[PDB]
Amino acid sequence: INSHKVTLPPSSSMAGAYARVDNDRGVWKSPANIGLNYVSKPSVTVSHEEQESMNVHGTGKSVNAIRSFVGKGTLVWGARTLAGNDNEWRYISVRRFFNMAEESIKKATEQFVFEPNDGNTWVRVRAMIENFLILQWRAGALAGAKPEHAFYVKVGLGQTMTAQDILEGNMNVEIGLAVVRPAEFIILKFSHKMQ
Amino acid sequence: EQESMNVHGTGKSVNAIRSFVGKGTLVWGARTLAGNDNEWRYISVRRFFNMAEESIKKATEQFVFEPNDGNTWVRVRAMIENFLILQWRAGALAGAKPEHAFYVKVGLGQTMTAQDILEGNMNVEIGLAVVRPAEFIILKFSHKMQ
Amino acid sequence: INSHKVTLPPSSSMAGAYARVDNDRGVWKSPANIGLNYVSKPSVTVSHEEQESMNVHGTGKSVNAIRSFVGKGTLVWGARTLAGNDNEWRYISVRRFFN
Amino acid sequence: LKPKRISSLLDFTTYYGGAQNEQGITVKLTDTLIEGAENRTINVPEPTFKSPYLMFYSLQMYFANGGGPCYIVSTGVYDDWSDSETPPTINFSDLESGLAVIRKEDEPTLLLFPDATNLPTDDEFYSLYNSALMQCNDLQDRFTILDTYSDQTYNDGVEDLDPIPALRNGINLTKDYLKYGAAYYPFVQTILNYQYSADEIVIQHLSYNPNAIATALDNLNAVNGPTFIDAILDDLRNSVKVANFASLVESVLSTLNELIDAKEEINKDVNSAIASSEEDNAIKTAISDALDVFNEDFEGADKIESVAKNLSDLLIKIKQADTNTKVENVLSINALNFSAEFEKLLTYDVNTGLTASVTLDLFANIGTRLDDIIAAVSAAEPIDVNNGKLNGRLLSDIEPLDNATYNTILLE
Amino acid sequence: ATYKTPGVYIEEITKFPPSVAQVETAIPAFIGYTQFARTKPSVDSDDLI
């Protein structure tokens, strides 16, 4: 009786691997080239040639493949979302880092809602957001040799706002980010050089 | 009759097994079937490229979904450079110093654009100077003044 | 019984060679000056002098020739379409790259 | 069609065996008188029909020149020769099927086909090596070693071709494929001997003193005696019960084996007299007809050589069956095969103390068929004028007869 | 040149030119009458005409 095993869809094992990688390496690391525990094999064999229309397609709807490799076992091999031809949103780790950073900044900003909308507030709002993004650059989530290559923050009258905006009660903050991408294809180019 | 075997207008060379007085039966020829190619005419050059490319390719699969930034490019360059320094010291690469024997280039503004990073591409360029055999030895004799 | 062989029209061997060259060198490379596998000889001999009205003609309808050369074997020697006097569309590789 | 990694020549013969025995060897003997002095001539020509299989020989050359571990991909087993001048053939579809399974292996770096020069046409030979270079281009980690189709000028069916320019025509790819292969010329002569069996070599002996029929008569007259063959025939006509019953079967089985051994030595005598009397073909037909009628009860008519094999395996089965069940010792000896096998020599001999009511009898036709042969080969002795003692004999059977002649044939 | 499945790939780039192979300069041809012109000297047939 105990020789028969259960076959499951893979979505709950993927959720455990999302939490394992985020604790080990951070949320900006792609959850691919990793192994799955309690798994003997995939149910279907997927070769090299039939994963090509899974990863890259004309609709842009990418499907990530679970595969086996000799000497390595069963691995997750694919880290794309269903907007797989988008230059901003094709990687899972980029989208989930934007989900973290936007919610953390939004919760810290509700202490400023009915504050005076003047130059004293705009200096402290800019420095709160800049101190947070400097820690993300030092941990490796933002690419750059220096901090002004990695991000920018702008807020103020004559920069993001008009005088008509002040009378209506609006304050505009603009934030731009440079998030690290994975290395999906590695191309080695060999050539002869003269003696 | 070995002259049209070794060198031919098609470039298709055939290696000859011959006998010599005092020496016995020997293999006398070391060419491939692309015998007029300046890159690929010798058997030992082609088989050294087959070894070196496969060893580097297997060592590179630990980097596939890694961050494609400056921290990765420093460690990828040093892994390939340490391997080729051992090949130069064993005599497979010709040169008086290591920068005469090979080069390795990888990085943004060297092998890659910013559009390449968004697509997920990392480019590594490797150039080699492999030792060739001495197939013809020509002795030139002359008189000098007393 | 096994000494008799099959003769075929050449269109299915050409399709295999189209896929071999596109994988090796790309779709912008002409599929000529290349060899065919499983082929002993062409069925008819075509010389240098009678390929001239095959390649260039007043109608513009060009026919590509399969020929033999000493030291080289049987090759495909011709890479034109049937609009062979057109300055935009006379080559196979130009048309298939636009597609 | 499974690739396997071996390490030495002893590993190969464990899983795959050795070479095929050659079928094209002939031995000739001639006795002559030169002004009163004897002269003996032994002639063994080199065979014109050889076996097409070369794999075991090539692995001997590989390990002798410094090879290490390698992979073996079988494509099938050996086929039999139809006769002494038709060796088997090599199929193109088997060798290309072996190339498809080696594409899935990671570790080999070199591709070889040791049987490929014995392919039927040269176009199949070049097309096989064009497929290996396309695999070396795709996997980009291997290399191919080539030969020519022949070492001399060969016939194509329409023309005669030289080996070097024919290889340059057959390989018709560009440089991106030609850089993965290398070719060598000419062939090499080795120190190895051919594999053969001494049970299949037949001697033809021409002598000035013909005693082929007389020596065949002396053996067959001696076996036709009361102590020799008549003594075989009159003999035939709980845990303590099984052990006593096995002693009774072992005495009957020992009697059958010396009758089968007597059948073997009779056939070697008549075959040497059939081959010696090539003159007067009507006499050869009578000697051949007398031999198959004697061989009826042994093979064709009754199962005499077949019951001696099944009784031996039934004897082993009853000694192991005593561990658990007495019904096992009852199901065999009464219901199943053991009660049925005894009936073919004597069907109802149990009617009295002596063997009577002889409904079925596979014996007592021996001496009737034997003395027919003695008279039939008696007509062959005045018609044979040239054949000596060892004409028509196997090479293994002359080693007790003439040991010095047997050792001389082995050197040639 | 196009990659869709993830992994490592190997490319070779051609830089060196090929070399020219020199032809023979003095091989003559003699055209005229002979005594027999046979491929096999024992068998009497002029198949080399």
Author numbering:
A (entry chain 4A): 496 to 690
B (entry chain 3A): 545 to 690
C (entry chain 5B): 496 to 594
D (entry chain 3A): 51 to 287, 321 to 495
E (entry chain 4B): 2 to 50
Source paper text:
CISs are macromolecular injection devices with an overall structure that is homologous to the contractile tails of bacteriophages. Their conserved modules include an inner tube, a contractile sheath and a baseplate complex. For firing of the extended apparatus, the baseplate undergoes a conformational change and triggers sheath contraction, which in turn causes the inner tube to be expelled and injected into a target. Here we performed structural and mechanistic studies on a clade Ib CIS gene cluster in the marine bacterium Algoriphagus machipongonensis PR1.
Typical CIS-like particles were found in both extended and contracted states. To explore the mechanism of AlgoCIS firing, we determined post-firing structures of both sheath and baseplate.
